[PDB]
Design a protein around this ligand. Structure first.
Ligand SMILES: CCCCCCCCCCCCCCCCCC(=O)OC[C@H](COP(=O)([O-])OCC(O)COP(=O)([O-])OC[C@@H](COC(=O)CCCCCCCCCCCCCCCCC)OC(=O)CCCCCCCCCCCCCCCCC)OC(=O)CCCCCCCCCCCCCCCCC
Ligand SMILES: CCCCCCCCCCCCCCCCCC(=O)O[C@@H](COC(=O)CCCCCCCCCCCCCCC)COP(=O)(O)OCC[N+](C)(C)C
Ligand SMILES: CCCCCCCCCCCCCCCCCCCC(=O)O[C@H](COC(=O)CCCCCCCCCCCCCC)COP(=O)(O)OCCN
Ligand SMILES: CCCCCCCCCCCCCCCCCCCC(=O)O[C@H](COC(=O)CCCCCCCCCCCCCC)COP(=O)(O)OCCN
Ligand SMILES: CCCCCCCCCCCCCCCCCCCC(=O)O[C@H](COC(=O)CCCCCCCCCCCCCC)COP(=O)(O)OCCN
Lengths: 308, 161, 438, 42, 205, 226, 82, 250
C-alpha cells in the first residue's frame, strides 16, 4: 500500500496493541475496573431475573459432530476417531464416529451433520439441514444439494434385511423442507420442496418428485417420470429440456455453495476488518472530501493506493 | 342460484408480450400481465432509473411514470382525465417540465395505459425526456449511462432529500 | 379539582408504559377513575362559593383552572361519555389518538385563560385530521374541512385574546375586564359561530361525523359542540355583552335561519349519521340564542339543553354505529323491517328518537321549556318562531322511522351483549335526567 | 356450508382454513344493489 | 359573573362620568401626522381633480401587469430564428390595452366615489360600495352569467374592507396603550410612567 | 401479583443491561472489541420473562433445539435437533417418554391457540407442525403431519405421514388416519398397538447416547474457554 | 365496479389539450433578472410616491390581481405568430 | 475457493468447519455484492438466517429457524409481514413464466411454519398455511389464503378473496368480509406483538462473547496471539493474483 503511517487502532480494530503511553495504560486499568464492576452488576441483575438469569454461552459446532461408536456395527460411511484422554476418564467412550467430507464440500454452521455421513466433493449441506447417521450410514454423492431445513433419516436394517441406509446419488437436488428417510436416490434427480420420501423408495435417474408430494413406502419411481400428489402419482414424463434444467440446478447450487462457504469461513478479525472496510467505503462516497484530493483509495480495501 | 365457478387462468395464458424500444435503440420483449399498468410492467422488467420520472402531482409522486410512444390503434385504451381536476395538473406539469419539445402526437404517460389482451405484441418506444429536477436525489442530469434498475429503488418517492 | 387534573394528565401518561396488549383494559380503568375523580370534584365543590366553586393555579396565569356551573356540567358529561368511546375503539393508535383528544378537550373546559383555552383546544387539530382521514373508512375532504374551519376561527379568537392581553394586561377570566370594541367581539364570536355549527359555517360538522369513527362521532357530538357554550359563558359574555346586545337582531337572524335551514336540509338526507348530524345543528341554535339573551333563565336553560343533547345524540350515534356493524350499510332505503328483525335495537332507537323530538319524559323537554321561556322573556315572537318550525324535525324523524320500521328483510340484525352494555348507562342517565334530576 | 364462529365458553378460534363459511358478523350484511349505489353517489 | 342566576357582564352608569387622566406626565410622539400631499389626494371636493390625482396608481398597476405578460411573450420568441413579424407590434397592444382598461376601471371607481359623496354630502360606506358596484359592472359587460353578479359584489366588497380595516379599526383602538394602567381602569394600582415608551423614532424612508 | 413480577423483571433487566453496558465500555477503553462478535446467540432453553422451560433430569434437549417459554418436559423425553417448541404465549406440556424429532414445530403461539398437551409415549415425526392440539398417550405422528388447533388425537392412534388434521376433528383410538383431509383408513392391528412402547424406549436409548456425545462436545469447549 | 365521476370531454381531445403544455421552456433567470432590477429601482421610486387613500390602494391591488396572468397561461397559449 | 474480486476483498484466513469449536452462524450476513437491508423494528431470531439481497421493511418479523436466502435474486418482505418458524423464503434466478423472479411479499402477510416460498408474488393481507409450497411464478392476489398442506404449481394464480386448498390447490370458498378485513391483518399484528416482546428482552451484545474472549486472552497471555493487518494482506494477495494472471500462458 501507499502509506505505512496508519494508526495502530486503524490497522488492528479487533484488538488494539498493548498500551505504551502513560495515558493509554491508565485507560487500560480504568477499563479493567469498569469490566469487573459491570460483571458484578450483571450478576446482581441476574439474581432478580430468576431461574436461568438470561445467561448466554457459546454453542457447540454440530456441523461436524460425532456419534457413539458401536463395536458391533462398524462405521460404514464416516470415519472413527479417538477422543481426548481426560474425556476418556470422564465419559468412558473409547472411540467416536465422525462425519467424512471432502474439502470442496460446504456445510453451513447452522446445519447438524451427525456421525455416519459421507458427503462428496462440491456437495452442499445448507442451513438447518439435519443429517443423522446415528444408527445407520448416510451417503451423499458429488454435486448434491441438501437444501434448507431438510431432514435426512435412517433406521436399522432389522430381521428382514431390508436396507435402511440412505444413498443419494450425484447431481441430486433435494428441495427445501423435504424429509428423506431411509431411501435410495439415483443420479440427476430433483426432489421437490416439501416432498416426503419414505422407507424403501427407489427414485430412478432423470425423474422429478414434485413439491409437497409424499411418495408411499416401497415405491419405485421409474426413470424420466414426474410424480406428484399426497399419494404421489405419475402425471407426465420429463421433457428433454427439463433434464438440462436438472443439471443446471445442480451446477448453480454448486456455485452458490462455493460463495456461501467463502463468506462463512472468514475468521472474526477478518470479518470485523471487512465491516470497517464497508463503513469507510460509505464515508468515502463523498468525493469532495479533503482526503480524496490527497489520495486515490483502493476499491476492495479502502487504503491509499496512489496520490491524486 | 349457484352458477358455474370459473377457474382462473394460469400466468402463461394471461401474459402478453410488448416490444419496447429503449433509448439506445434496442428492442426489448417485456412480458407483462393483463390488468397491470404499463409503468409497473416497464419497471419490473429491469429498465434503468433514468428511464422513469415520478408522477408530478400533489399526491402522486410515489408513482413512477415514463414518456412513451403509443401507436394510433391503441389510443383508445388511454385513460380520460378531467381538466378541472388536479390529475390534469400532474399531466400538464409532466409535459411542461419533462417532455417539452420532444412531444409528439403519440406521446403519453405509462400510468394512464393499462395492459390487456388486445395489446399483445404492441410496439411502444420510450420517448426522449429533458433534464428534470425535483430533489437532488430525484433528478435527471441528461445522461442515460447508469446501469441500475428502477426496481432496485426502495425509496417510494420525492420528499426533502 | 387537583385530583381531576392529575387523572386527566395520567390517562395519556399510562399509554406510554402499558404492555400494548393491556392497553384497552388500562384505558377503560383510567376512564372510570377519571369519572370518579370528576364525582370527587363535584363533591368538593360547595354551592356556597357562588362565583367559582373551585380555582387552582399552578404557577402562572395560563395554569389557572377553575370550575363553574357550566364547566362542572360539561366536564361531568365528557367524563361520563368517554368510557363508551374507549370500549368502541380498538388498536393502540386509535386509543392514543382518542385519549389525547379527550385530555385536551377536558383541560379546555376547566381552563380560565383564553390563551390556554386556545392552546389546549386546538392541540386536537391534527388528531382529527388523521382520525377522520384514516386509511380505508375515512375521507380526506372532511378532515380538510374541519381542520381549516377550526384553524381560521381559532386564529381569529387568538387575535382577540392578544388584543385583550395587550390592552388590559391580562386575559384571565377571573380579572374583570369589559370592552366595547366590535372587532375584538367579532374575533371572539367567529370561533363560537364556527364551533357551534351555525349557518353558513356548519358544513364541516356533517362530513366529519359521517367519516369519523363511532367513538369519534360520540365525542364530537357529546362535548366538542358544547365547548362553544363554555367559551360563551366564560370568555365572551363577561367581556363582550355590549356587542351581543348591540347585535341581537343579527344574532337572532343567524340563529333562527340556522334552525330553519338545518331542519330543511335534514329532510334531504338518505344517510342515518347525516340525519343525526343535521339534527345536532338545528339543536345548537336554541342553545346559542338562549345564552345570548344574557339572562338567568337563558344560561341555565342552555347548559341544561347541552346536557340533554350530550345524552341523546351520543346514543343515536352509538345505535347507528351498531346497526352499521351489523349491516355494513347506513342508507335508510336498504334498511327495512328493523322492528321485527331487531326488536331490542328498535326499542332503544325509538326511545332515543323520541328524546330527540323533545317528548316530556325526556330531558330535552325540560331543557326546551326553559330555553323557550327565556326567549319568551325577550319577546313572544322569538319563542313562537322556534316553536312552530320544530314541526320540521317531526317530519324527517317520522319519515326515517317509518322507512326503517316495516318491510321485507331476510337478515337478523340485532345487537349483542356488548352493544347493550354500551348503551345501558346512556339510557339510565336519560331517564334520571328526564324525571327532573337534571 | 356454514358454521358457528362465536363460542360463549371463550374457546373461540377463527377458522380461516375451514371449508364451511363462518357465521360471522358479515353473515347478516345487506346484499346491496348497483343502481342504488349509483343513486347514492349521484 | 359565572353563575346561572344573574346576567353576565355589568353595566356602567350613564350619569356618572370619570375625569380623563393622562396616561403619562409627558407625551412624546413618534407617529407623524398626515402630509399635505395625503390630504390633497384624499380631497374629493372636485371629482375631476380627485380622479386625476389617484389614477396614476391604477395606470402604474396596469403597466406592470402588461409588462409581465409582454415579457412572458418576449421570453418565448426565439432570438436564433429571424421572425417575419415585428415583436413590438405584437407586444405593444398587450401593455397599452392592459394599462388603458385598468385606468378606465380606476377612473370609474374614483369618479363615482367622489360624485356620490358630493351628492350625499356625507362620508359613508355606501359611496365605496356604489363606486365598486359600478366598476364591477363595467368589468362584466359581456361576460357569462355568474360574472354579472360576482364582480359587482367583489368590487363593492373591496372598499368595505378598506374602510373597515383602514379607517374604523385604527380610530376604534387609539386610546388603548398597553403600558402603565389600562385605559378604562386607572383606579387600579399599576406602575405609572413619567414618559411613554418610544419603541422607534419617526420613520423617514 | 402479576404486576409485582413485571416490576421485578423490569428492575432486574435494567440492572443487567447497565452492567453489560459498563462491561462493554471497559472493553472499549481497554481496546478489545470482542463484544462486537456476531456469533450464534441461540440458547437451547430460552425464557420469556419469568416463564422458563421446566425440564426433567433424564431429558435430552439438543443444543440446536429451541425449547422456549414455559414448557414442561417430563422425564425420559427428548427434543431433538433443530426442533422448535414454543410455549411463550400459552404453555406446552410434554409427557414421559415422548419424543420431538428433528425440524419439528410444536407451539401454541397463535392468538387463540389452546394450551398444547402431549401425552406419554408420543413420537412427533420429523417435520410435523403441531399447533394448539391435545395428543393422547401412545400416539405415533407421521413425519410431515399438520395438526391444527383444538384438534384431539385419542390414545393408541397412528397418523400417517402427510396427513393434515382440521380443527375440532377428533382422531379416535385404535385407528389409522391419513389424507390432507384426515380420514380413517383402517383399524390398527395388534402388532402396531404393541409397537408404541418399543418405539418410545428405543428413542430414549438413542437420546441417552446423544446426551453422552453432547457432554463430550461441552468438555472440548471447556478446554478452550478455561 | 364502483360509481365514479363522469369526466367531461373525450380522452384524446383532453390529452391533446394537455399536450399543448409541452413547449420549449425558457429558464426562469431571464424573468428573475428583470424583476430584480426593476424591483430594486421600483422600491427606490416608491419612497417618493404620493400617499394614497387606503380605498384606492385596495382597488389597485384588486385590479392588479385580476390583471395578473399566470406564467403557465402564457405558456400554453403562446404562438410565435403576428 | 477465494473470490479475488469480492467487494471487501479476498479472504486472508479461511477456517475449516472441523476446526470450529463453537457455532459462529450470523443471523444477517453479506453474500459477495448483495447486502440485506433491515429497518429498526425488524426482529430476526437468533436461529434465523437472512443472507443476500433481502429487504426487510418496518415491523417485519423473522422467527426461529426461518431461512430467507436472497442469493439468486431479490427478496422483499412488506410491512408487518411475519415469517414464522422453519419457513424458507428463496428466490430463483429466472422464472418459468418469464416475469421477474424476485420473491416479493406484501404487507400483513403471514407465512406459517415450514412453508416454502420461491420466486412468488404474495399480495397484501395473505396467509400461507403450514407446509404450503408456492412454486416459481405463482402469484397470490391480495386477501387470499392458502390452506395448510397445499401446493401452488409454477405459473398458477389464486384470485383475491378466495380460500384455496389441496395439493393441486383448488377453490374451496370465498373468504368473508370480516375475515379479509380483520383476521388476516390481526394475525400479523399478533405476531408483531410476540416479536416485539422477544426484542424487548434482547441485549445489544449478549454475554456469549465472553467465552471466546477467554480463549483469545489465554492466547494473548501465552504469546501465541498474532496481530494481522488483514487490509494490507488483502491488497498484496490481489496484487499477486493480477501479476500471476498476466504471467499465465493458458
Ligand atoms: C419586464 C419584467 C416583467 C415583470 C414586470 C414587473 C417587474 C417588477 C417591477 C416591480 C416589482 C415589485 C411589485 C410587483 C408585485 C410584487 C410581486 C413580486 O415581485 O414577486 C415576484 C414575482 C415572481 O415571483 P415568483 O416566486 O417566481 O412567483 C410566485 C407565483 O407562484 C408565480 O407563479 P404563477 O404566476 O403561476 O401563480 C400566480 C399566483 C401567485 O399568487 C399571487 O400572485 C399572490 C398575489 C396576492 C396579492 C399580493 C399582495 C397584495 C398586496 C399589495 C400591497 C399594495 C396595496 C396595499 C393594500 C392592499 C391590501 C390587500 O396567483 C394566481 O394564481 C393568479 C391570481 C393572482 C392574484 C391572486 C389573488 C386573487 C384575488 C382576487 C379575487 C377576485 C376573485 C373573485 C372571484 C373568484 C371566483 C371563485 O414577480 C412578479 O410576479 C412581478 C410581476 C408584476 C405584475 C404585478 C401586477 C400588479 C402588481 C401590483 C398589484 C399587487 C397585487 C399582486 C398581483 C400578483 C403579483 C404577483
Ligand atoms: C327495561 C326496563 C324495565 C323496567 C321498567 C321500570 C319501570 C319504571 C317504573 C316507572 C316509575 C314511575 C314513577 C314516576 C314518579 C317519579 C319518581 C320520582 O321522581 O321520585 C320522587 C318521589 O316522588 C314519588 O315517589 C312519586 C310516587 C310515584 C308513584 C305515584 C303513583 C304512580 C302513578 C304514576 C304517575 C306518575 C306521573 C308523574 C309524571 C311526571 C323523588 O322525590 P324528591 O325527593 O322530591 O326528588 C326531587 C324531585 N325531582 C326528582 C324532580 C328532582
Ligand atoms: C386584505 C385581504 C383582502 C381579502 C383577500 C382575500 C383573499 C382570499 C382569502 C381566502 C382565505 C381563506 C383560506 C381558505 C381557502 C379555501 C380552502 C382552499 C380550497 C381547497 O382546494 O382546499 C382543498 C380542501 O379544502 C377544503 O376542503 C376546505 C373547504 C373550504 C374551507 C372553508 C373555508 C373556511 C371558512 C371560511 C370563512 C370562515 C370565517 C371567515 C371569517 C385542499 O386542497 P389541496 O390540499 O389538495 O391542494 C391542492 C391545490 N389545489
Ligand atoms: C352584514 C351582517 C353582519 C354579519 C354579522 C352577523 C352577526 C354577527 C354579530 C356578532 C356579535 C359581536 C360582533 C361585533 C360586531 C360584528 C358585526 C356587527 C355588524 C357590523 O358589521 O357593524 C359594523 C361595526 O362593526 C365593525 O366595525 C367590525 C365588524 C366586524 C369586523 C369583521 C372582521 C373582524 C375580524 C377581527 C379579528 C379580531 C381582531 C381583534 C383586534 C358597522 O356598523 P356601524 O356601527 O358602523 O353602522 C353603520 C350603518 N349605517
Ligand atoms: C369580512 C366582512 C366583509 C363583508 C362580507 C359580506 C358578504 C360579502 C358579499 C359582498 C357584498 C358587498 C359587501 C357589503 C357588506 C356590507 C353590509 C351591508 C350593510 C349596509 O349596507 O350598511 C352599510 C354599512 O355596513 C357596512 O358597510 C359595514 C359592515 C361591515 C360588513 C359586515 C362585517 C361582518 C360580516 C362578517 C360575516 C362573516 C364573515 C365571512 C365573510 C351602510 O352604512 P352607511 O354608513 O353608509 O350609512 C348609509 C348612509 N349613507
Amino acid at each position: 500500500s501507499l502509506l505505512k503511517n496508519y494508526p495502530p487502532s486503524y490497522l488492528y480494530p479487533f484488538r488494539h496493541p498493548k498500551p505504551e503511553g502513560v495515558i493509554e495504560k491508565v485507560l487500560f486499568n480504568l477499563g479493567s475496573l469498569f469490566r469487573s464492576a459491570g460483571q458484578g452488576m450483571d450478576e446482581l441483575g441476574s439474581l432478580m431475573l430468576g431461574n436461568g438469569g438470561m445467561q448466554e454461552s457459546v454453542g457447540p459446532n454440530l456441523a461436524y459432530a460425532p456419534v457413539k461408536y458401536n463395536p458391533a456395527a462398524a462405521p460404514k460411511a464416516g470415519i472413527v476417531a479417538p477422543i481426548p484422554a481426560s474425556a476418556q476418564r470422564v465419559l468412558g467412550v473409547k472411540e467416536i464416529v465422525l462425519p467424512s467430507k471432502a474439502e470442496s464440500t460446504f456445510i453451513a454452521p447452522n446445519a447438524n451433520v451427525l456421525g455416519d455421513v459421507k458427503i462428496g466433493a462440491k456437495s452442499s449441506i445448507w442451513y438447518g439441514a439435519v443429517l443423522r447417521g446415528d444408527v445407520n450410514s448416510i451417503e451423499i454423492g458429488d454435486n448434491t444439494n441438501v437444501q434448507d431445513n431438510v431432514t435426512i433419516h435412517v433406521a436399522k436394517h432389522s430381521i428382514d434385511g431390508k436396507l435402511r441406509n440412505t444413498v443419494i446419488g450425484n447431481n441430486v437436488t433435494i428441495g427445501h423442507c423435504a424429509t428423506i428417510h431411509a431411501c435410495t436416490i439415483a443420479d440427476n434427480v430433483i426432489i421437490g420442496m416439501g416432498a416426503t420420501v419414505l422407507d424403501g423408495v427407489k427414485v430412478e435417474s432423470g425423474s422429478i418428485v414434485g413439491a409437497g408430494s409424499i411418495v408411499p413406502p416401497n415405491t419405485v419411481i421409474p426413470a424420466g417420470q414426474v410424480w406428484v400428489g399426497n399419494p404421489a402419482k405419475f402425471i407426465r414424463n420429463v421433457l428433454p429440456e427439463e433434464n438440462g434444467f436438472i443439471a443446471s440446478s445442480a451446477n448453480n447450487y454448486d456455485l452458490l455453495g462455493q460463495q456461501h462457504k467463502f463468506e462463512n469461513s472468514k475468521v472474526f478479525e477478518e470479518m470485523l476488518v471487512e465491516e470497517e472496510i464497508a463503513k469507510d467505503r460509505e464515508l468515502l462516497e463523498d468525493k469532495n472530501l479533503a482526503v480524496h484530493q490527497l489520495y486515490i483509495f483502493d476499491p476492495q480495501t479502502q487504503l491509499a493506493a496512489r496520490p491524486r | 342460484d349457484h352458477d358455474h365457478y370459473t377457474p382462473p387462468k394460469t400466468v402463461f395464458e394471461d401474459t402478453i408480450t410488448i416490444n419496447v424500444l429503449d433509448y439506445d435503440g434496442k428492442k426489448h420483449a417485456v412480458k407483462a400481465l393483463i390488468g397491470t399498468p404499463l409503468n409497473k410492467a416497464l419497471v419490473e422488467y429491469g429498465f434503468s432509473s433514468t428511464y422513469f420520472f415520478p408522477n408530478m402531482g400533489y399526491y402522486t409522486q410515489h408513482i413512477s411514470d415514463a414518456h412513451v410512444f403509443i401507436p394510433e390503434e391503441y389510443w383508445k385504451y388511454v385513460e380520460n382525465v378531467d381538466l378541472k381536476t388536479d390529475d390534469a395538473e400532474a399531466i400538464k406539469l409532466m409535459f411542461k417540465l419533462v417532455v417539452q419539445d420532444y412531444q409528439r402526437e403519440t406521446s403519453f404517460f405509462a400510468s394512464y395505459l393499462t395492459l390487456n389482451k388486445e395489446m399483445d405484441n404492441m410496439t411502444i418506444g420510450f420517448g426522449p425526456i429533458k433534464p428534470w429536477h425535483i430533489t437532488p436525489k430525484w433528478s435527471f442530469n441528461g445522461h442515460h449511462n447508469v446501469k441500475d434498475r428502477m426496481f432496485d429503488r426502495l425509496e417510494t418517492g420525492p420528499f426533502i432529500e | 379539582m387537583s385530583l381531576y387534573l392529575f387523572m386527566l394528565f395520567l390517562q395519556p401518561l399510562s399509554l406510554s408504559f402499558v404492555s400494548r396488549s393491556f392497553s384497552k383494559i388500562s384505558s377503560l380503568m383510567m376512564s372510570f377513575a377519571t369519572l370518579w375523580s370528576a364525582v370527587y370534584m363535584w363533591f368538593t365543590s360547595n354551592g356556597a362559593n357562588q362565583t367559582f366553586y373551585q380555582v387552582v393555579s399552578w404557577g402562572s396565569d395560563w395554569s389557572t383552572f377553575g370550575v363553574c356551573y357550566t364547566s362542572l356540567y360539561i366536564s361531568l358529561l365528557c367524563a361520563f361519555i368517554f368510557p363508551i368511546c374507549v370500549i368502541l375503539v380498538q388498536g393502540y393508535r386509535a386509543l392514543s389518538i382518542l385519549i389525547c383528544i379527550q385530555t385536551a378537550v377536558s383541560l379546555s373546559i376547566v381552563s380560565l385563560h383564553m390563551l390556554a383555552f386556545y392552546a389546549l383546544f386546538e392541540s386536537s387539530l391534527l388528531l382529527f385530521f388523521i382520525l377522520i382521514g384514516r386509511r380505508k373508512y375515512g375521507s380526506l375532504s372532511a378532515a380538510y374541512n374541519i381542520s381549516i374551519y377550526t384553524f381560521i376561527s381559532a386564529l381569529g379568537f387568538l387575535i382577540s385574546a392578544f388584543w385583550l392581553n395587550w390592552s388590559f394586561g391580562s386575559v384571565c377570566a377571573l380579572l374583570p375586564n369589559e370592552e366595547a370594541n366590535s372587532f375584538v367581539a367579532f374575533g371572539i364570536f367567529i370561533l363560537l359561530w364556527v364551533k357551534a355549527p351555525l349557518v353558513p359555517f356548519h358544513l364541516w360538522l356533517p362530513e366529519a361525523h359521517v367519516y369519523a369513527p363511532t367513538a369519534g362521532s360520540v365525542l364530537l357530538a357529546g362535548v366538542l359542540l358544547k365547548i362553544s357554550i363554555v367559551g360563551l359563558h366564560v370568555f365572551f359574555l363577561p367581556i363582550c355583552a355590549s356587542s351581543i346586545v348591540k347585535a341581537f337582531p343579527l344574532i337572532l337572524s343567524i340563529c333562527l335561519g340556522s334552525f330553519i335551514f338545518s331542519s330543511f336540509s335534514t329532510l334531504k338526507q338518505i344517510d342515518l349519521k347525516k340525519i343525526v348530524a343535521y339534527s345536532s345543528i338545528s339543536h345548537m341554535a336554541i342553545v346559542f340564542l338562549s345564552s345570548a339573551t344574557n339572562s338567568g333563565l337563558g344560561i341555565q336553560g342552555a347548559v341544561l339543553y347541552c346536557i340533554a343533547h350530550g345524552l341523546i345524540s351520543p346514543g343515536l350515534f352509538l345505535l347507528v354505529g351498531i346497526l352499521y356493524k351489523n349491516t355494513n350499510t347506513k342508507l335508510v332505503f336498504y334498511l327495512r323491517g328493523l322492528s321485527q328483525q331487531a326488536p331490542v335495537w328498535w326499542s332503544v332507537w325509538v326511545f332515543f328518537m323520541l328524546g330527540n323530538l323533545a317528548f316530556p319524559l325526556f330531558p330535552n323537554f325540560i331543557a326546551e321549556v326553559v330555553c323557550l321561556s327565556a326567549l319568551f322573556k325577550n319577546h313572544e315572537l322569538y319563542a313562537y318562531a322556534f316553536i312552530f318550525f320544530s314541526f320540521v324535525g317531526t317530519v324527517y324523524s317520522s319519515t326515517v322511522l317509518g322507512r326503517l320500521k316495516g318491510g321485507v328483510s331476510s337478515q337478523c340484525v340485532d345487537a349483542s351483549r356488548l352493544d347493550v352494555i354500551s348503551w345501558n348507562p346512556l339510557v339510565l342517565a336519560t331517564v334520571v335526567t328526564g324525571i327532573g334530576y337534571m | 356450508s356454514s358454521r358457528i364462529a362465536g363460542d360463549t365458553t371463550g374457546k373461540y378460534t377463527p377458522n380461516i382454513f375451514s371449508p364451511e363459511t363462518p357465521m360471522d358478523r358479515s353473515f347478516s350484511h345487506v346484499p346491496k344493489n348497483p343502481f342504488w349505489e349509483a343513486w347514492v353517489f349521484r | 359573573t359565572f353563575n346561572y342566576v344573574i346576567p353576565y357582564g355589568g353595566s356602567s352608569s350613564y350619569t356618572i362620568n370619570n375625569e380623563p387622566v393622562k396616561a403619562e406626565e409627558v407625551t412624546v410622539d413618534f407617529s407623524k401626522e398626515p402630509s399635505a400631499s395625503s390630504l390633497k389626494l384624499a380631497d374629493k371636493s372636485d371629482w375631476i381633480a380627485y380622479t386625476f390625482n389617484n389614477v396614476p396608481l391604477m395606470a402604474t398597476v396596469g403597466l406592470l401587469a402588461g409588462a409581465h405578460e409582454a415579457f412572458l411573450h418576449y421570453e418565448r420568441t426565439p432570438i436564433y430564428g429571424k421572425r417575419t413579424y415585428n415583436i413590438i407590434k405584437k407586444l405593444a397592444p398587450i401593455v397599452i390595452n392592459k394599462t388603458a382598461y385598468a385606468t378606465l376601471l380606476g377612473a370609474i371607481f374614483c369618479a363615482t366615489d367622489a360624485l356620490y359623496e358630493n351628492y350625499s354630502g356625507k362620508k359613508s360606506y355606501t359611496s365605496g360600495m356604489v363606486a365598486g358596484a359600478a366598476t364591477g359592472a363595467v368589468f362584466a359587460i359581456g361576460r357569462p352569467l355568474p360574472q354579472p353578479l360576482v364582480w359587482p359584489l367583489v368590487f363593492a366588497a373591496a372598499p368595505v374592507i378598506a374602510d373597515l380595516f383602514g379607517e374604523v379599526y385604527p380610530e376604534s383602538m387609539k386610546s388603548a396603550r398597553g403600558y402603565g394602567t389600562p385605559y378604562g381602569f386607572e383606579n387600579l394600582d399599576d406602575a405609572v410612567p413619567t414618559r411613554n415608551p418610544i419603541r422607534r423614532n419617526p420613520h423617514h424612508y | 401479583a402479576s404486576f409485582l413480577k413485571t416490576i421485578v423483571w423490569r428492575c432486574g433487566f435494567a440492572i443487567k443491561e447497565t452492567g453489560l453496558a459498563l462491561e462493554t465500555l471497559g472493553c472499549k477503553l481497554q481496546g478489545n472489541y470482542s463484544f462486537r462478535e456476531k456469533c450464534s446467540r441461540h440458547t437451547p432453553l430460552t425464557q420469556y420473562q419469568f416463564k422458563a422451560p421446566s425440564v426433567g433430569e433424564s431429558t435430552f434437549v439438543a443444543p440446536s433445539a429451541l425449547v422456549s417459554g414455559d414448557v414442561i418436559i417430563g422425564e425420559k423425553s427428548s427434543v431433538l435437533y433443530n426442533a422448535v417448541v414454543r410455549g411463550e404465549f400459552k404453555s406446552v406440556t410434554i409427557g414421559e417418554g415422548s419424543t420431538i424429532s428433528d425440524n419439528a414445530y410444536v407451539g401454541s403461539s397463535s392468538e387463540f391457540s389452546p394450551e398444547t398437551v402431549i401425552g406419554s409415549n408420543v413420537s412427533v415425526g420429523s417435520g410435523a407442525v403441531l399447533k394448539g392440539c391435545t395428543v393422547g398417550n401412545n400416539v405415533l405422528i407421521g413425519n410431515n403431519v399438520i395438526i391444527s388447533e383444538k384438534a384431539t388425537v385419542e390414545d393408541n392412534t397412528i397418523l400417517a405421514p402427510g396427513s393434515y388434521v382440521p380443527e375440532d376433528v377428533v382422531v379416535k383410538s385404535g385407528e389409522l388416519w391419513s389424507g390432507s383431509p384426515a380420514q380413517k383408513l383402517r383399524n390398527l392391528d395388534e402388532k402396531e398397538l404393541a409397537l408404541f412402547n418399543t418405539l418410545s424406549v428405543g428413542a430414549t436409548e438413542l437420546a441417552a447416547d446423544h446426551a453422552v456425545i453432547m457432554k463430550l462436545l461441552e468438555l472440548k469447549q471447556k478446554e478452550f474457554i478455561k | 365496479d364502483e360509481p365514479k365521476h363522469q369526466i367531461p370531454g373525450n380522452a384524446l381531445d383532453n390529452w391533446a389539450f394537455l399536450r399543448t403544455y409541452a413547449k420549449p421552456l425558457p429558464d426562469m433567470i431571464h424573468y428573475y433578472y428583470y424583476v430584480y432590477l426593476f424591483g430594486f429601482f421600483f422600491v427606490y421610486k416608491v419612497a417618493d410616491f404620493p400617499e394614497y387613500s387606503p380605498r384606492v390602494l385596495v382597488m389597485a391591488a384588486l385590479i392588479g390581481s385580476l390583471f395578473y396572468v399566470r406564467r403557465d397561461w402564457v405558456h400554453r397559449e403562446f404562438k410565435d405568430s403576428p | 475457493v477465494n473470490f479475488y474480486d469480492a467487494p471487501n476483498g479476498p479472504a486472508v484466513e479461511q477456517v475449516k468447519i472441523e476446526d470450529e469449536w463453537y457455532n459462529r452462524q450470523r443471523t444477517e450476513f453479506n453474500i459477495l455484492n448483495k447486502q440485506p437491508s433491515k429497518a429498526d423494528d425488524v426482529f430476526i431470531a437468533p436461529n434465523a438466517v437472512v443472507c443476500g439481497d433481502v429487504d426487510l421493511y418496518q415491523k417485519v418479523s423473522i422467527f426461529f429457524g426461518a431461512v430467507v436466502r436472497g442469493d439468486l435474486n431479490t427478496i422483499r418482505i412488506g410491512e408487518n409481514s411475519t415469517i414464522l418458524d422453519k419457513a424458507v423464503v428463496h428466490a430463483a434466478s429466472t422464472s418459468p413464466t418469464g416475469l421477474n423472479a424476485a420473491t416479493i411479499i406484501g404487507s400483513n402477510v403471514t407465512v406459517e411454519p415450514h412453508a416454502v416460498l420461491r420466486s412468488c408474488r404474495i399480495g397484501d393481507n395473505c396467509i400461507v398455511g403450514a407446509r404450503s409450497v408456492v412454486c416459481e411464478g405463482a402469484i397470490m392476489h391480495p386477501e387470499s389464503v392458502l390452506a395448510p398442506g397445499s401446493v401452488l404449481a409454477p405459473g398458477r394464480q389464486i384470485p383475491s378473496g378466495e380460500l384455496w386448498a389441496g395439493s393441486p390447490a383448488k377453490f374451496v370458498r370465498k373468504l368473508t368480509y370480516y375475515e379479509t378485513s380483520n383476521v388476516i391483518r390481526e394475525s400479523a399484528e399478533h405476531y408483531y406483538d410476540i416479536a416485539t416482546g422477544f426484542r424487548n428482552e434482547t441485549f445489544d451484545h449478549g454475554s456469549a462473547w465472553r467465552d471466546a474472549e477467554a480463549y483469545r486472552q489465554k492466547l494473548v497471555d501465552y504469546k501465541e496471539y498474532n496481530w494481522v493487518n488483514y487490509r494490507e494482506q488483502k491488497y498484496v494477495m490481489r496484487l499477486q493474483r493480477d501479476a500471476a494472471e498476466l504471467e499465465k500462458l493458458l
